[PDB]
Amino acid sequence: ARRESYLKATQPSL
Amino acid sequence: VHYARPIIILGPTKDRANDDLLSEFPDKFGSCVPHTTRPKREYEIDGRDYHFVSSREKMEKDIQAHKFIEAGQYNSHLYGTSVQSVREVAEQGKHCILDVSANAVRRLQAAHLHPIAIFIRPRSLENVLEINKRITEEQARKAFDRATKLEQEFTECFSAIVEGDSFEEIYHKVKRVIEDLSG
């Protein structure tokens, strides 16, 4: 049930 | 109906633990759906893949009014998990299994939703390889490092810290933890 779009938005590279 | 506390599991194998709780106990564990301003693809289904938001300004205002436990931008569109989406599941008496980052824990608490935050703490690189048998050494070192940084920075927000020599041990502990903290 992964949502890759969502994970990229909410786990940005710091 | 009694409020059920939402759940955030973090650490190595948390996603397997999430899937397992949902597939074993569908009467006590549920999911909510994130929001996005990205336009809906023909095959996607509003309320199932996302809650599709037509006004980016609307979502921007809601984000600034603290309506989201988590929010960010990808490919120039907004994404987030809303307080209300968690509340609806909780109000129906099901533990909302959340796939959100650790920063959401403080936002859920500040929204008065009383989360259960469980950290699966790897004991070492080797322990990571014990509990996740599908990954390279490199992936295991990255997971171990991430978990070390997670604990160093967020340990004050954990409801429980769980350890074990196998995923089965961790999973049994996670279920026992949820029962103890819910009653």
Q: In a mutagenesis test of the A interface, which of B74, B97, B142 is the best target, namely the one with the most A β-carbons within 10 Å?
A: B74
Query: Is A1 in CB contact (< 8 Å) with chain B?
Result: yes
Determine how β-strand B35-36 pairs with β-strand B77-82. Answer: antiparallel
Please name which of B181, B136, B141, B139 lies closest in space to residue B158, comparing C-alpha atoms.
B181
- CA distances, B50 to each of B26, B29, B59, B134, B152 (Å): 21, 19, 13, 30, 33
Residues 42..101 of B with a Cβ closer than 8 Å to A: which? 49-50, 70-75, 77-80, 99-101
At B145, the amino acid letter reads: D
Please name which of B58, B88, B129 lies closest in space to residue B98, comparing C-alpha atoms.
B88
Minimal C-alpha gap between B59 and chain A (Å): 14
- Least CB–CB distance from A8: residue in B34, B74, B99: B74
CA B65 to chain centre: 22
Ramachandran angles phi, psi of A4, nearest 5°:
-60, -40
Q: For B14-40, what is the HEC assignment?
A: HHHHHHHHHHHCCCCEECCCCEECCCC
Enter the tokens of residue B38.
């990205």
Burial B102-114 (b: 16+ CB within 10 A, else e): bebbebbeebebe
Specify which residues B160 forms β-bridges with. B118
Query: Is A10 in CB contact (< 8 Å) with chain B?
Result: yes
All structural domains of chain B: 1-183 (3.40.50.300)
Q: B63 exposed, middle or buried (CB, 10 Å; 0-12, 13-18, 19+)?
A: middle
Dist CA B27 CA B9 (whole Å)? 19
Experimental technique behind these coordinates:
X-ray
Query: Is A14 in CB contact (< 8 Å) with chain B?
Result: no
Residue with tokens 């650790």: B102
Enter the tokens of residue B37.
């301003």
Q: In a mutagenesis test of the B interface, which of A2, A6, A11 is the best target, namely the one with the most B β-carbons within 10 Å?
A: A6
Q: Please tell me what DSSP assigns to residue B156.
A: G
